[PDB]
Chain A
Amino acid sequence: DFLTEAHLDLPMEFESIGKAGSRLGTALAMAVDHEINMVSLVRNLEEFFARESCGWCTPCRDGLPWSVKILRALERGEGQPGDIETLEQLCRFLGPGKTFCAHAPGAVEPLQSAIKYFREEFEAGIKQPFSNTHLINGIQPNLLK
């Protein structure tokens, strides 16, 4: 999980970083500057995490590319209403115990951290309204409210 400047004065132990909503891991930290857009950065992380999946079990294999495509739409500004909620439910349903191994919880930790801390960057990628169906000539569509 990503951490902020306020978490910089935190000891580099397993339990201390694990208390503040992250992990110690390999303790080889990566610094992200203000010039780097977080949506594209998480997009690259998800491309790596979805193209390097082993392909055994359903949620990682068939939900990480969905997050990749959603972040592709957000990077180009073609986001549609309901994508951030989809990403949040995707993070919720790809936690520990849902998948066969621990590749997918580690995949969705940076996504949920970037949703939590940098939600205004993710909301800036939605410009077009939601349109999944197209108008079939001769059939009146159903309009849920």
Chain B
Amino acid sequence: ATIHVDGKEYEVNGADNLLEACLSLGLDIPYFCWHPALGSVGACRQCAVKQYQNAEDTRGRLVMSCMTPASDGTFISIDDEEAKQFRESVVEWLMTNHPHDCPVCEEGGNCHLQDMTVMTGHSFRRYRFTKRTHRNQDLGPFISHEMNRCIACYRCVRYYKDYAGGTDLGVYGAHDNVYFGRPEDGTLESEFSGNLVEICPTGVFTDKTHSERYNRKWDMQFAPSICQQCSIGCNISPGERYGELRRIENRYNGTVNHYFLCDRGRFGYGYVNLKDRPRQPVQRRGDDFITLNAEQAMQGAADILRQSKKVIGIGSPRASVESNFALRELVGEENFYTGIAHGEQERLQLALKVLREGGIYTPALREIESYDAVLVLGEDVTQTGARVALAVRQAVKGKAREMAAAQKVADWQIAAILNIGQRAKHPLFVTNVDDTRLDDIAAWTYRAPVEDQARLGFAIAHALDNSAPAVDGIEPELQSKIDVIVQALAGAKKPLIISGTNAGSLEVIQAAANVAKALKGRGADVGITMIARSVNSMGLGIMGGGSLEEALTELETGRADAVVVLENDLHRHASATRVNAALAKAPLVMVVDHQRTAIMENAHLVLSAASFAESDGTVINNEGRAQRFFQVYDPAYYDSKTVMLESWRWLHSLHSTLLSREVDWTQLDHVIDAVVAKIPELAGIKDAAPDATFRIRGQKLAREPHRYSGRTAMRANISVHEPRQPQDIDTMFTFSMEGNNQPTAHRSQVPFAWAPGWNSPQAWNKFQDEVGGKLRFGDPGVRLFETSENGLDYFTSVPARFQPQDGKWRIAPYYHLFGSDELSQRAPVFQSRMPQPYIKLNPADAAKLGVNAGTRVSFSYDGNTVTLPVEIAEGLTAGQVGLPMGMSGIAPVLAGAHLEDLKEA
């Protein structure tokens, strides 16, 4: 289609409305209620443009550019006097009841309403009467609520209900007394409530964690990074001020995490700002604790390493690719051990084998929203990989989108989309040990142990293609449900199969792979998705190594007299007693970490590593996409005593000092080239982000905005002489505003969104080729592997039916979004949010034990008689005990294990 704006001819996409058709070309129209992902509702009436149907038309009509399709031959005027006066009047009407709260507002300089008040040129107030006020609700530890600043643009209710699926936020009130919130006070229990701080154009829903230690947007030092709290790897923009991480903002990735994060990744950053964190290298002689800087620590570590017969290294799925590779090259290829256990590594290797060898195209997170029928086997997505659950909700609403598009309704008429599709939605079949958070839209939910879920998957795979291995012994009711799932999946056009290593079983992944292979054999565009546990689980599995049991038995047998533990707590993947014995037995433990782990008492040397905010690196998400996360700040700028370096830098300098007795602090590009040289299958991480020599017309990229303040006074308490700003030799960014952050620069890594006249999170519209689509000049991060030409065979080893053995209790994993991450539970803001540790029991088994809810049951696992209060789970199957993974003293390695001595105490 071809449109005419003010006499200028523009080629646009005719399936789009006029608002983002003009926003794609760079034409500024004020707007509040429209969002690129939600749709158009025509509420705020701010997007008015004067439309003409002929080339010679004087009057025209003031039409809504978010509600008028951009067909071929529309002559719209934006800067006309009538349209500008009406837009100014709408801004004025929104400004009649707005409070005088801008200095004391958390979105000052980040406000969409401020940008559209200055954009329309409204600065004179002739309203003289009183302003309406509203009370505020306590929405929990995350969201600060201030309803006086609202403009009734209906974005919060639209996102939270029609997009996030939440049920506790709604619109109440009257004519002008419109309220947006809960029917009472209490925590917003949705797992995607954190995006309300950027969906809301005003300062109603604000980040309370940021509001504790608050600084303005221009005071933030930003960086592009990857969220480390689970395996999805959503792109984030960490921003710091005064040496502590202040706020995690959303970063636009058109393929992964376009406009929405989750609460664990958005509010779980509080572990970085802990004072218990090691900031200097600390060495122990017996009970004496001394502090060294980098050089003497490196020389002493190299001396003790040379005085040992075999140095072993225990990596972690939390650390980056470069740091794990540095440990591997420091300790040797054969002596490198992955920090995960044997079962977790087996499930991870199977998931990687299905991904990069199964011949089935695994889709990205943006591509999930277009799949028709979704089968989730084993994985509790909403509490582990929550963004995949949100994309699953979008793919479910795709059916109503399809019926709406069949009735000649444009895609941006979202109200008509839910109008036509009242309750009809795509099939979703979830399996878990209990009820999930996806049960509101799921076509079926199977509450069963992992053996029965795996057998259900094998039954689906056999009933699709008869060459698949059959399971015998299914009840006819479950057989009818199997037939229903088969009819739903076979009749679809883009089936999706979602599994992962969080189910605690291998046969679940085998069954999901067999279902995907059977769907592929019938001639369908089937996709698969394995959700891993940690952020860099996939990269550690790709690199490989031994299990934690092998490292512990090397330490216990005496063949390893020196162990380097890289960013691992070692109690999350093994028992605490065995780890403590194997570490006290070893005469040298060197823990390189940025967190005060429990094993640092046994550590002979502690090396203060850097977290994601203070280190550069590459992480591989759950779909094989290599992504580079950059440094936000130099920790030594404010606290000059702080010797806190990148873990790969620590290990590479230790390797160099061990070899040639010289200390050589390397660069990130050298380590990246070493990875892509020694490991052929990690060669794609060179293309994840360009090197430190990349310039936009000769200059670097700025980490802080052009109006960064207090350069000559933020360090004046220590010394009045402002030092040289830190130099980033590793990456292409600089710790200064002398850099390029234009929206039209030929780059993919964007630290923050800012345009002249666009200060809100809506400033991301200028950084894309089309608004709501991919990022301009391509999205960052590349896939490590392609789809194979041929796939795997049928996994024949079906499991047996779950028969509850007396005495032994199978442990059913109950993952929580707030508490199952190793680092997110260390945040002090999650302690007021995470639930209490409850052991979950069937009513029948609790009645057999005689225990009621509330009382304490003690259970012993490897000499640890730990007591937990009891919650009753009706959906849990008999013979199991429900345990929360990742909590205090309950490791995720407990999944699938037995539990003897379960008595009331």
A residues with CB within 8 A of B: 50-59, 61-66, 69, 80, 82, 86, 89, 93, 97-100, 132
Contacts known (A82-B126, A132-B125, A132-B128); A57 close to B43, Cβ less than 8 A: yes
In Å, the complex CA distance between A53 and B174 comes to 8
Indicate whether B176 reaches chain A with its CB closer than 8 angstroms. Answer: yes
Contact in complex: A55, B175 (CB < 8 Å): yes
In Å, the complex CA distance between A49 and B174 comes to 13
Contact in complex: A62, B61 (CB < 8 Å): no
Chain B 37-49, CB-CB to A under 8 Å as 1, else 0, gives: 0000011111010
Min CB distance A34 to B, Å, is 31
User: What residues of A have a CB within 8 angstroms of the CB of B152 in the complex?
Assistant: 55, 58, 61
In Å, the complex CA distance between A86 and B128 comes to 12
In Å, the complex CA distance between A33 and B48 comes to 41
Contact in complex: B96, A66 (CB < 8 Å): yes
Of A50, A54, A100, most buried by chain B (CB within 10 Å of CB) is: A100
Indicate whether B86 reaches chain A with its CB closer than 8 angstroms. Answer: yes
Inter-chain pairs besides A61-B175, A62-B93, 10 sampled, C-beta below 8 Å: A57-B42, A59-B93, A64-B175, A66-B96, A66-B127, A89-B89, A97-B61, A98-B45, A98-B62, A132-B125
In Å, the complex CA distance between A93 and B93 comes to 11
In Å, the complex CA distance between A58 and B320 comes to 50
Q: Which residue of A lies closest to B173 (CB)?
A: A55
Contact in complex: A58, B129 (CB < 8 Å): no
The 8 nearest A-B residue pairs measured at CB:
A62-B93, A53-B175, A69-B129, A58-B45, A55-B175, A132-B128, A55-B178, A63-B93
Min CB distance B147 to A, Å, is 14
Contacting residue for B89 out of A52, A55, A80, A93, CB 8 A? A93
Contacting residue for B97 out of A52, A62, A99, CB 8 A? A62
User: What residues of A have a CB within 8 angstroms of the CB of B151 in the complex?
Assistant: 58
Contacting residue for A51 out of B96, B127, B175, B178, CB 8 A? B175
In Å, the complex CA distance between A86 and B350 comes to 71
A-B contact pairs, 7 of them (CB 8 A): A58-B43, A58-B90, A59-B45, A62-B176, A86-B126, A97-B63, A98-B48
Contact in complex: B174, A55 (CB < 8 Å): yes
Contacting residue for B128 out of A52, A56, A80, A97, CB 8 A? A80
Indicate whether B94 reaches chain A with its CB closer than 8 angstroms. Answer: yes
Q: Which residue of A lies closest to B129 (CB)?
A: A69
Min CB distance B122 to A, Å, is 14
Min CB distance B641 to A, Å, is 47
Min CB distance B379 to A, Å, is 40
Min CB distance A107 to B, Å, is 12
B residues with CB within 8 A of A: 42-46, 48, 61-63, 85-86, 89-90, 93-94, 96-97, 125-129, 151-152, 154, 173-178
User: What residues of B have a CB within 8 angstroms of the CB of A64 in the complex?
Assistant: 175
Contact in complex: A50, B175 (CB < 8 Å): yes
Q: Which residue of B lies closest to A51 (CB)?
A: B175
Min CB distance B230 to A, Å, is 39
User: What residues of A have a CB within 8 angstroms of the CB of B97 in the complex?
Assistant: 62
User: What residues of B have a CB within 8 angstroms of the CB of A82 in the complex?
Assistant: 126
In Å, the complex CA distance between A79 and B125 comes to 17
Contact in complex: B46, A58 (CB < 8 Å): yes
Of A54, A58, A63, most buried by chain B (CB within 10 Å of CB) is: A58
Q: Which residue of A lies closest to B32 (CB)?
A: A58
Min CB distance A129 to B, Å, is 12
Contact in complex: B86, A93 (CB < 8 Å): yes
In Å, the complex CA distance between A97 and B62 comes to 7
User: What residues of B have a CB within 8 angstroms of the CB of A54 in the complex?
Assistant: 175
User: What residues of A have a CB within 8 angstroms of the CB of B90 in the complex?
Assistant: 58-59
User: What residues of A have a CB within 8 angstroms of the CB of B85 in the complex?
Assistant: 93
Contacting residue for B43 out of A65, A98, A100, CB 8 A? A100
Min CB distance B87 to A, Å, is 10
Min CB distance B77 to A, Å, is 15
Q: Which residue of B lies closest to A52 (CB)?
A: B175
Min CB distance A64 to B, Å, is 8
In Å, the complex CA distance between A22 and B386 comes to 57
Contact in complex: A55, B128 (CB < 8 Å): no
Contact in complex: B128, A100 (CB < 8 Å): no
In Å, the complex CA distance between A22 and B94 comes to 30
Contacting residue for A53 out of B44, B48, B96, B176, CB 8 A? B176
Min CB distance B44 to A, Å, is 5
In Å, the complex CA distance between A50 and B177 comes to 11
User: What residues of B have a CB within 8 angstroms of the CB of A56 in the complex?
Assistant: 43, 154
Q: Which residue of A lies closest to B174 (CB)?
A: A55
User: What residues of B have a CB within 8 angstroms of the CB of A50 in the complex?
Assistant: 175-176
Min CB distance B434 to A, Å, is 40
In Å, the complex CA distance between A88 and B656 comes to 81
In Å, the complex CA distance between A59 and B90 comes to 6
Min CB distance B15 to A, Å, is 24
User: What residues of B have a CB within 8 angstroms of the CB of A61 in the complex?
Assistant: 152, 175-176, 178
Contact in complex: A58, B93 (CB < 8 Å): yes
User: What residues of A have a CB within 8 angstroms of the CB of B128 in the complex?
Assistant: 80, 132
Contacts known (A50-B175, A100-B42, A132-B126); A58 close to B62, Cβ less than 8 A: no
Min CB distance A53 to B, Å, is 4
In Å, the complex CA distance between A89 and B93 comes to 12
User: What residues of A have a CB within 8 angstroms of the CB of B45 in the complex?
Assistant: 57-59, 98-100
Min CB distance B626 to A, Å, is 46
Min CB distance B155 to A, Å, is 13
User: What residues of B have a CB within 8 angstroms of the CB of A59 in the complex?
Assistant: 45, 89-90, 93
Min CB distance B280 to A, Å, is 52
User: What residues of A have a CB within 8 angstroms of the CB of B126 in the complex?
Assistant: 82, 86, 132
Min CB distance B709 to A, Å, is 25
Q: Which residue of A lies closest to B178 (CB)?
A: A55
User: What residues of A have a CB within 8 angstroms of the CB of B93 in the complex?
Assistant: 58-59, 62-63, 66
Min CB distance A11 to B, Å, is 29
Contacts known (A57-B45, A69-B129); A62 close to B173, Cβ less than 8 A: no
In Å, the complex CA distance between A52 and B176 comes to 10
Contacting residue for A55 out of B63, B86, B94, B176, CB 8 A? B176
In Å, the complex CA distance between A53 and B86 comes to 20
In Å, the complex CA distance between A93 and B87 comes to 10
In Å, the complex CA distance between A17 and B433 comes to 71
Of A50, A61, A63, A98, most buried by chain B (CB within 10 Å of CB) is: A61
In Å, the complex CA distance between A50 and B96 comes to 15
Of B125, B128, B129, B154, most buried by chain A (CB within 10 Å of CB) is: B128
User: What residues of A have a CB within 8 angstroms of the CB of B63 in the complex?
Assistant: 97
In Å, the complex CA distance between A57 and B86 comes to 14
In Å, the complex CA distance between A56 and B173 comes to 11
Min CB distance B118 to A, Å, is 18
Contact in complex: A62, B43 (CB < 8 Å): no
User: What residues of A have a CB within 8 angstroms of the CB of B125 in the complex?
Assistant: 132
In Å, the complex CA distance between A51 and B176 comes to 8
User: What residues of B have a CB within 8 angstroms of the CB of A132 in the complex?
Assistant: 125-126, 128
Min CB distance A92 to B, Å, is 9
Of B97, B152, B176, most buried by chain A (CB within 10 Å of CB) is: B176
User: What residues of A have a CB within 8 angstroms of the CB of B94 in the complex?
Assistant: 58, 62
Contacts known (A57-B45, A132-B126, A132-B128); A65 close to B89, Cβ less than 8 A: no
In Å, the complex CA distance between A97 and B126 comes to 25
Min CB distance B582 to A, Å, is 66
In Å, the complex CA distance between A132 and B127 comes to 8
User: What residues of B have a CB within 8 angstroms of the CB of A89 in the complex?
Assistant: 89
User: What residues of B have a CB within 8 angstroms of the CB of A66 in the complex?
Assistant: 93, 96, 127, 129
Min CB distance A9 to B, Å, is 33
Q: Which residue of A lies closest to B46 (CB)?
A: A58
In Å, the complex CA distance between A56 and B415 comes to 13
User: What residues of A have a CB within 8 angstroms of the CB of B175 in the complex?
Assistant: 50-55, 61, 64-65
User: What residues of A have a CB within 8 angstroms of the CB of B177 in the complex?
Assistant: 55
User: What residues of B have a CB within 8 angstroms of the CB of A97 in the complex?
Assistant: 61-63
Contact in complex: B61, A65 (CB < 8 Å): no
In Å, the complex CA distance between A106 and B753 comes to 43
User: What residues of A have a CB within 8 angstroms of the CB of B176 in the complex?
Assistant: 50, 53, 55, 61-62, 65
User: What residues of A have a CB within 8 angstroms of the CB of B173 in the complex?
Assistant: 55
